[PDB]
């Protein structure tokens, strides 16, 4: 039972820090870089749960 | 007006093609039975479990496309009548002037 618990917590922290890096790269949003672009059409999606 | 009509024709034709193939695929599927052939071990995988749409959303897709076509047809009819009346009036007035 112990091992099961540790495995679950490991999984959670892994995905959490993955989101952390994504969102830090996100907050690095200051103007004037190249990755900014046009791909209009992101205003209809039943995406996130 | 001709341009717009042809474009919408093409789009709806496309989606109808799609529905035809999917329907025929499932028809070919359904005649299976336990004793028959076409019966194999294929392993599990998430591609089998992938999700792409939901019934109401697919329905509303179709509904929007239908209504778009309907409006364009109405507009075409209106423009047709207007053009006819203009032709008639032009002819009559030039006739009277010459008389």
């Amino acid at each position: 039972s112990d091992r099961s618990a540790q495995h679950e917590l490991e999984k959670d922290l892994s995905d959490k820090q993955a989101a952390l890096r994504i969102d830090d790269k996100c907050q690095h949003l200051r103007n004037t870089s190249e990755g900014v672009s046009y791909f209009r059409g992101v205003e209809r999606v039943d995406a996130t749960v | 007006q001709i341009r717009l009509n042809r474009e919408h024709k093409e789009s709806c034709e496309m989606n109808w093609s799609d529905k035809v193939e999917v329907y025929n695929i499932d028809d070919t599927c359904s005649r299976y039975t336990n004793e028959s052939t076409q019966v194999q071990f294929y392993p599990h995988s998430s591609k089998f479990e992938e999700s792409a749409s939901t019934p109401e959303t697919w329905a509303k897709f179709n509904h929007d496309n239908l209504l778009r076509a309907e409006r364009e047809r109405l507009a075409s009819v209106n423009l047709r009548k207007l053009i006819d009346c203009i032709l008639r009036d032009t002819a009559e007035d030039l006739r009277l002037q010459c008389d």
């Binding site: - | 392993p43 599990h44 995988s45 998430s46 591609k47």
Partner: protein, 55 residues
């Protein structure tokens, strides 16, 4: 939970898609460039014609 076959297929799909995009862009470049100069030259010719007549 996945399949080696399908992983291999996914990779091949990705790379061929990249190639398609690149070829599209290049062949667009060529004829766009062409159209630029031909339009410019014909406009020059017409302008000269006009000024000559009115002189």
């Amino acid at each position: 939970r996945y399949t080696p076959d399908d992983w291999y297929r996914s990779n091949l799909v990705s790379f061929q898609e990249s190639n398609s995009s690149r070829h599209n862009s290049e062949r667009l470049r060529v004829d766009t460039s062409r159209l630029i100069q031909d339009k410019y030259q014909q406009i020059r010719k017409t302008q000269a014609h006009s000024t000559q007549n009115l002189g």
